[PDB]
Design a protein around this nucleic acid. Sequence first.
RNA 1: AGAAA
RNA 2: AGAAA
Lengths: 198, 198
Amino acid sequence: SLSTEAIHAVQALKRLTAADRSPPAATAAASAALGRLLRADLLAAMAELQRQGHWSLALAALHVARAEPWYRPDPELYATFVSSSPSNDPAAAAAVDALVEAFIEEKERGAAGGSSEGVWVGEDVYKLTRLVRALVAKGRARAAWRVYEAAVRKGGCEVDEYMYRVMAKGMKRLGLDEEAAEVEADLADWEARHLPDE
Amino acid sequence: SLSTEAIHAVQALKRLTAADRSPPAATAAASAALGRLLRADLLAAMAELQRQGHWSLALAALHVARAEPWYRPDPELYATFVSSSPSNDPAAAAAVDALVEAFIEEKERGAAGGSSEGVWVGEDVYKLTRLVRALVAKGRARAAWRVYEAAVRKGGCEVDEYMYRVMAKGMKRLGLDEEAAEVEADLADWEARHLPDE
RNA sequence: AGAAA
RNA sequence: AGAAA
């Protein structure tokens, strides 16, 4: 559930942006109501806004969160934003794609080393699969592909059959037959190394 | 559905093999999570893994199952493994062929008698047809042929028109025109004995 | 756990 | 029941 501090923060955010729906003031209202909540409270506020349907406000909260010092690029966090995004909404869809681009840029922002390259290597497989699943579920075939290609194809994040099947089926039914075939190939390679051989 | 015992077993299996994807440890994890489940639970676990896409794990479960005392070579069981196998996967395809060879060896393992030869004679026609259908559907023309030839041609398992048509059409479209013709001949013989003559 | 073409 | 060239 939500601490009274987070509940009051959400109410505060809504009531302020009510008198002015405009996004410029909406931002200033977010840092005003959510500016300095403990990580746990800010995350709960965000989730509550998503749950209620105030997606644009949830995004505003994300903005605030990105400024916090504890902030870290997290696939699960991004998946909730995709899941809660409005269906049949061109603007929303673009926002989702943009979000995916933001997640990969945030994650890879800290990489300049021949040092053991692992920006994606240590990533949570389940969470990353959840993000991909959500993107597919919302028809963001391209976005899904950027993520897979970034974290698995290049990032060298070791995934499993479940992840592959999700992608292959996703790309297929979404009309990227080209990429579907590549996933199947990646899967084929995987199988070629885990399947008991003789 | 799945007993909580089987659900927990599957979770357990995944979580263990997660820290180590390698097949040697994957096997030890299977006998560790699935080692002593009731037949019903082990079978349900296997099917759930297939459903999720963890085919290599489903195969690991099969290994465990083969050691159980209640285990019996079953065409249906093998068909599910063929159906759930990844398409466009050289390794998988070989695994399927190997599986078919394992099924025929397991079945015929108990035959050393001029006693009424019936290792295949009492076989379930529908299930056996399902296995053949799946193999064809995955392009395993050879594998399909081994089964047919073993159980019907030699094993003396009495099948029906549905089975023949499935094979003939399967071999044809799969490019074994030689074997297709033989099936049609087998069918011709069948017809010659069931068709009302005059 | 990454809930159902 | 062995679901659609």
